[PDB]
Amino acid sequence: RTKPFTVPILTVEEMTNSRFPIPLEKLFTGPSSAFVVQPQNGRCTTDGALLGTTQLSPVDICTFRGDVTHIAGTQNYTMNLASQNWNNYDPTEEIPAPLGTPDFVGKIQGVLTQTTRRDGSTRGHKATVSTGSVHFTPKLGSVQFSTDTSNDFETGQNTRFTPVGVVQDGSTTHQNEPQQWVLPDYSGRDSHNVHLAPAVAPTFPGEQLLFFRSTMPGCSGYPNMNLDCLLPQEWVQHFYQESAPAQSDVALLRFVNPDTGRVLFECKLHKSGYVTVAHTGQHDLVIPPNGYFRFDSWVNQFYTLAPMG
Amino acid sequence: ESRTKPFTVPILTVEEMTNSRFPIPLEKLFTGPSSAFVVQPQNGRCTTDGALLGTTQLSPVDICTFRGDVTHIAGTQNYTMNLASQNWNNYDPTEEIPAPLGTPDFVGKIQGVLTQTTRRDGSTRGHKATVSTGSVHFTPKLGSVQFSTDTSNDFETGQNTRFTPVGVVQDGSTTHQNEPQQWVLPDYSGRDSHNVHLAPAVAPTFPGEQLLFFRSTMPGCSGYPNMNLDCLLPQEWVQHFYQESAPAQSDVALLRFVNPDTGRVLFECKLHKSGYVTVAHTGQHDLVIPPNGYFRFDSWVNQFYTLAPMG
Numbered sequence: 001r002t003k004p005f006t007v008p009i010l011t012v013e014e015m016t017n018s019r020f021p022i023p024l025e026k027l028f029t030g031p032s033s034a035f036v037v038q039p040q041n042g043r044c045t046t047d048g049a050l051l052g053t054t055q056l057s058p059v060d061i062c063t064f065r066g067d068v069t070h071i072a073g074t075q076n077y078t079m080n081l082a083s084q085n086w087n088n089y090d091p092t093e094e095i096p097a098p099l100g101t102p103d104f105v106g107k108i109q110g111v112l113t114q115t116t117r118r119d120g121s122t123r124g125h126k127a128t129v130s131t132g133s134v135h136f137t138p139k140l141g142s143v144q145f146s147t148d149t150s151n152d153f154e155t156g157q158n159t160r161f162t163p164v165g166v167v168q169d170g171s172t173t174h175q176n177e178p179q180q181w182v183l184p185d186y187s188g189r190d191s192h193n194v195h196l197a198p199a200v201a202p203t204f205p206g207e208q209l210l211f212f213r214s215t216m217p218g219c220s221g222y223p224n225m226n227l228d229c230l231l232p233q234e235w236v237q238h239f240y241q242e243s244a245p246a247q248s249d250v251a252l253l254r255f256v257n258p259d260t261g262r263v264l265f266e267c268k269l270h271k272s273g274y275v276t277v278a279h280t281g282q283h284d285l286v287i288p289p290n291g292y293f294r295f296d297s298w299v300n301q302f303y304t305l306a307p308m309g
Numbered sequence: 310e311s312r313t314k315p316f317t318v319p320i321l322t323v324e325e326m327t328n329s330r331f332p333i334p335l336e337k338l339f340t341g342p343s344s345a346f347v348v349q350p351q352n353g354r355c356t357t358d359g360a361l362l363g364t365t366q367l368s369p370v371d372i373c374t375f376r377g378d379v380t381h382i383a384g385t386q387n388y389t390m391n392l393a394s395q396n397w398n399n400y401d402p403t404e405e406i407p408a409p410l411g412t413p414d415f416v417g418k419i420q421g422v423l424t425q426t427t428r429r430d431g432s433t434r435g436h437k438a439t440v441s442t443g444s445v446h447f448t449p450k451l452g453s454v455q456f457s458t459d460t461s462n463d464f465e466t467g468q469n470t471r472f473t474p475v476g477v478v479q480d481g482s483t484t485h486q487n488e489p490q491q492w493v494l495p496d497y498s499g500r501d502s503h504n505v506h507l508a509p510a511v512a513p514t515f516p517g518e519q520l521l522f523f524r525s526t527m528p529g530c531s532g533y534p535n536m537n538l539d540c541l542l543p544q545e546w547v548q549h550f551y552q553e554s555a556p557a558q559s560d561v562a563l564l565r566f567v568n569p570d571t572g573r574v575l576f577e578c579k580l581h582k583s584g585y586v587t588v589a590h591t592g593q594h595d596l597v598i599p600p601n602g603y604f605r606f607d608s609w610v611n612q613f614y615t616l617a618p619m620g
C-alpha cells in the first residue's frame with residue numbers, strides 16, 4: 001500500500017496561524033455564504049502542493065524586503081520588492097504575488113529596519129503598509145509604506161518590514177477593518193488578480209467550514225483582530241514534507257481529548273486542503289487545551305459527520 | 310542495533326528553514342573555533358530523539374516574545390511586565406526550566422513593539438519598546454521583566470499586553486559591534502542568583518572537529534550592533550524531532566549534505582544525539598552551498614567515525 005497520510009500531533013495552541021506570524025488560539029465555525037473564503041496563504045493540498053501565495057516559513061509571512069526610495073515631501077517610502085533570499089522578484093512567474101504577501105485588506109503596522117552596507121550602521125522606524133491602497137501593487141514589484149520619518153532611510157540599501165499587528169480609524173465604525181475576507185488588488189486598481197488558490201465552501205447539507213483562528217495584535221484604534229486560516233501553518237509544512245497521496249475525497253479526522261480519551265468531534269479534511277465540520281451557526285468551539293487531531297481514514301464526500309456538540 | 314522507526318531530518322534547504330533563537334529565516338552555514346567562548350544557548354535545544362531542553366519550545370513565532378500585564382514606573386517611560394505563559398495562564402516560576410519558554414538566551418537590547426488591547430471596548434495601542442536582557446531588571450525566571458518605551462500615560466494596567474521582537478540595537482558612541490553578545494546568557498533570575506536547568510554547554514570533542522552553526526542576521530534598529538546570530542539546530546529540526554521521536558541507535562547521526570540536482574554529496578557531518586552538529590574543519594569559513602541542497606540522514610555511526618574533510 002501507498003504512503004499513510006497523517007496530520008501533526010499538535011494542539012491548537014502549539015501551532016501557528018498561516019496568514020500572519022502569530023500562534024493559533026481557538027477553533028471557530030460559522031456560515032460562510034455572505035463572504036468569499038479565498039485566502040492565499042496557508043493553502044496546500046493534503047498531498048503537499050502549495051497553492052496561492054503559500055510558502056513554508058512561518059515567520060516570513062506578511063513581511064517585505066527590498067530597497068526603498070523616499071516620496072518627495074511626504075513621510076512615505078516606495079519599496080521595490082526583492083525575493084525572500086534578496087534575489088530579484090520575478091513578476092512574470094505564475095503566482096498571484098510574492099509568496100507570503102498579505103492576503104487580506106487592512107493596514108498592517110510594523111517596523112522597517114535598514115542596514116547601511118558600507119559601515120554596518122542600522123536604523124529602524126515604525127511603518128505602516130495599507131493593502132487597500134492604490135500603491136499596494138506587490139505583483140508589480142512595489143508597495144508603499146507610510147512612516148514617521150522624512151530623512152532617515154537611504155537609497156540602495158537592504159530594508160526589511162516586520163509585521164506587528166493592525167490598525168483602524170477611531171472615528172470609523174469600530175471593527176470596520178481589516179477585512180480578512182477581501183483580497184487586495186495585487187496589481188493595483190483595474191487589474192485582475194491571477195493564479196489564485198480556489199475559493200472554498202461547504203458542499204454538504206448541515207456542514208460549515210472549520211476555521212483555525214488567531215487574534216492579530218491591535219496597534220491603534222478599534223480594529224477587527226479576528227483572523228481565520230484554513231490550515232495551521234504546521235499542517236502545510238507537514239503535508240509538504242510528507243506528500244502522502246490522497247486515497248479518497250476526504251480525510252476523516254477525529255479531535256480527541258487525551259484526558260478522557262474520548263473523541264470530541266469529527267471533521268473532514270478535504271483533499272484540496274480545508275476543513276468542514278457538521279454544525280449550523282456561529283460557534284467558538286470549547287476544547288481541552290491538550291486536545292489534538294488524528295487522521296482516521298479516507299472516506300468519500302458523502303460521509304455523514306456526527307453533529308459537533 | 311534494533312528494529313525501530315527510522316530516524317530522519319526534514320527535507321528542507323537551509324533558506325527554507327528558520328532560526329531557532331529569533332523569529333527570522335536561516336541564511337547560511339557557518340563554522341569556526343569555539344574554545345574561546347561558552348556555547349550554551351537555551352533556545353534551539355532538542356535531542357535527536359525529541360527531548361526539548363533549556364527554554365526551547367515549538368512555535369517559531371513565539372521566540373523572544375513576552376506577554377503579560379504591565380504597570381508603569383513613575384516619572385520614566387519604563388514599564389514592568391508581569392509575565393504570563395504562552396496560553397495566557399500564569400507563569401509558574403517553579404517549573405523546572407531556566408526561564409519562561411522562549412525567553413531570549415543572550416545579552417543584548419532587543420527592540421520591538423508593545424501592543425495592548427482593552428478587553429472591555431476593543432481599543433488598542435502599540436508603542437516602540439526595548440528590552441535590555443543584561444539589565445538588573447531582567448528577571449524572567451521570577452516572572453517579571455522591564456521595557457523602556459516612548460509613552461508615559463498610554464498603557465493601561467490589568468490588560469493583555471504582548472511584546473513583538475523586531476531586532477537589536479547598540480550605542481554608537483561605544484565600540485562598534487560590542488553588543489548584542491550572542492554567547493552570553495542573561496541572568497534569568499537577575500543579580501546574585503544562579504541560572505538553573507540549563508541545556509549543557511557544547512564543544513566538539515574530536516580531533517579536527519568544529520561546530521556547524523546555522524546562521525541568520527538579526528535586523529538592526531539602531532547603531533552598530535553585532536547582528537550575527539547562530540543556532541545549533543534549525544527550528545524546523547526541533548519541531549521535527551519533537552514530533553517524530555525516532556529512537557537513537559548511537560550517539561552520532563551521520564548526515565550528508567546533498568545536492569538533489571546532481572545527486573552528489575557536498576560534505577558530511579555529525580549530528581549528535583544531544584542535539585548539535587559538528588564538521589571536520591579548522592578555521593572560520595562561510596560554507597558555499599547550492600541553494601537547493603538539503604541534509605540527509607544516512608546512518609548511525611559509533612563514537613570513533615572520522616568525517617571526510619569538508620572543503
Ligand SMILES: CC(=O)N[C@H]1[C@H](O[C@H]2[C@@H](O)[C@@H](CO)O[C@@H](O[C@H]3[C@H](O)[C@@H](O)[C@H](O)O[C@@H]3CO)[C@@H]2O)O[C@H](CO)[C@@H](O[C@@H]2O[C@@H](C)[C@@H](O)[C@@H](O)[C@@H]2O)[C@@H]1O[C@@H]1O[C@H](CO)[C@H](O)[C@H](O)[C@H]1O[C@@H]1O[C@@H](C)[C@@H](O)[C@@H](O)[C@@H]1O
Pocket residue numbers: 168169170171219220221222432433434435463
Ligand atoms: C489617547 C486616546 O485614547 N486617544 C483617543 C481619543 O480619546 C479621547 C477621549 O477618550 C476623550 C473622552 O473624554 O478624552 C480624551 O482625553 C481625556 C482623557 O482621557 C482624560 O484622562 C482627561 O481627564 O479628560 C480628557 C478629555 O478628552 C481622549 O484623548 O479619542 C480619539 C477618538 O477616538 C482617538 O482618535 C481617533 O482614533 C485614532 C486611532 C485615530 O484614528 C484618530 O483619527 C481618531 O480621531 C484617540 O486615539 C488616538 O488617536 C490619535 C490620533 O492621532 C492617535 O492616532 C493615537 O494613535 C490614537 O491612540 C491609539 O488608539 C486610540 C484610538 C486609542 O484607543 C488609544 O488607546 C491608542 O493609543
Ligand SMILES: CC(=O)N[C@H]1[C@H](O[C@H]2[C@@H](O)[C@@H](CO)O[C@@H](O[C@H]3[C@H](O)[C@@H](O)[C@H](O)O[C@@H]3CO)[C@@H]2O)O[C@H](CO)[C@@H](O[C@@H]2O[C@@H](C)[C@@H](O)[C@@H](O)[C@@H]2O)[C@@H]1O[C@@H]1O[C@H](CO)[C@H](O)[C@H](O)[C@H]1O[C@@H]1O[C@@H](C)[C@@H](O)[C@@H](O)[C@@H]1O
Pocket residue numbers: 121122123124152479480481482530531532533
Ligand atoms: C542621524 C544619525 O545618523 N545620527 C547618528 C550620528 O551620525 C552623525 C555623525 O556621523 C556626524 C559625523 O559625520 O555627522 C552627522 O550628520 C552629518 C552627516 O553624516 C554628513 O552627511 C554631513 O556631512 O554632516 C552632517 C552634520 O553632522 C550625523 O548625523 O552619529 C552618532 C554616533 O555615530 C549616532 O548616535 C550614536 O549611537 C546612537 C545609538 C546613540 O546611542 C547615540 O548615543 C550615539 O551618539 C547617531 O545615531 C542616532 O543617535 C541618535 C541619538 O539620540 C538616536 O540614537 C538615533 O536613533 C540614531 O540614529 C540611528 O543610528 C545612528 C547610528 C544611525 O545609524 C542612524 O541612521 C539611525 O537612525
